[PDB]
């Protein structure tokens, strides 16, 4: 398990990879796995003017 930085809840996200995008099951926060060795979630950086498809 790990703490959501928006909500504060402890959640299970499963077998994640580094820089992977996850949705918090409680608050619906979109988050980035910024570390695995110490499992750390983080809110995404700001959208740049050339981000997308």
């Amino acid at each position: 398990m790990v703490e959501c930085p928006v909500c504060g809840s402890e959640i299970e996200i499963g077998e994640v990879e580094l820089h992977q995008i996850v949705e918090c099951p409680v608050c619906g926060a979109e988050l980035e796995v910024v570390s695995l060795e110490p499992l750390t979630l983080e809110e995404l950086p700001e959208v740049e003017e050339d981000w997308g498809e």
Partner: protein
Amino acid sequence: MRIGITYTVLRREEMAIKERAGEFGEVVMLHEDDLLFPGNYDLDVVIIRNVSHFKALYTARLFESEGIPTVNSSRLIFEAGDKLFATLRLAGKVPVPEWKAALSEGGALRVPDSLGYPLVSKPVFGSWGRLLAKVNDRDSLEAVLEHRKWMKNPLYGIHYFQEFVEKPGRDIRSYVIGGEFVGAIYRYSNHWITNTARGGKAEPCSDPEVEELSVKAWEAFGEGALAIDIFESEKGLLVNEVNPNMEFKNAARVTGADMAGKLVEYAVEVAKT
């Protein structure tokens, strides 16, 4: 087979592509921090998934310079990802909305004389519906041009406009990979800007005409994996835009089509080329 995947963050898309790639050979996950050139890479193909369009473009070119083929190519990322270069390539081959391009505020002021009001203003390099403006009159045109002038990016000084198309509460998003149509959706919204990024709702589209037109639109480029934007109008279907770093998680869910697998299959085809 060593298949590189180049990424900023791992969205559903990238997770699914990674899965599919693993069934064909060894996958090398390449975060942007890992990208250093000239470098010593041992790769048969790289699938380019960087969230930044310009980072995608430059990393594709760099891998090409190491003799490593890229999906999509740097040439396609640039042409398809620029609204104006793409419109120029599309204009021979498929119906598109009426458009104009001007190189100064002064020249942009004459655009209504050709297109009429309302018109749509948009930056040549954006995505996700960013900086799209519906300009209903001269006062709004001036405000829009004044703001684009003050913005730092010199690209905002390339003034691209289209006639405002009256859509029926939705537009169409289709996918063609290596010349094969893989699926399409409608994107519904109460607002005229329909991207799922803000956040249009996806429904499957089985329209055979969008399939035929999407393949034609792909053929104007003649390579790669493209997400195509099409509008319905009183004059029929119009091709608006093509996107060289496709998102598809909703499109996949709603159509049941395997966009990710098709992209990877195409990548293994170019790896053997």
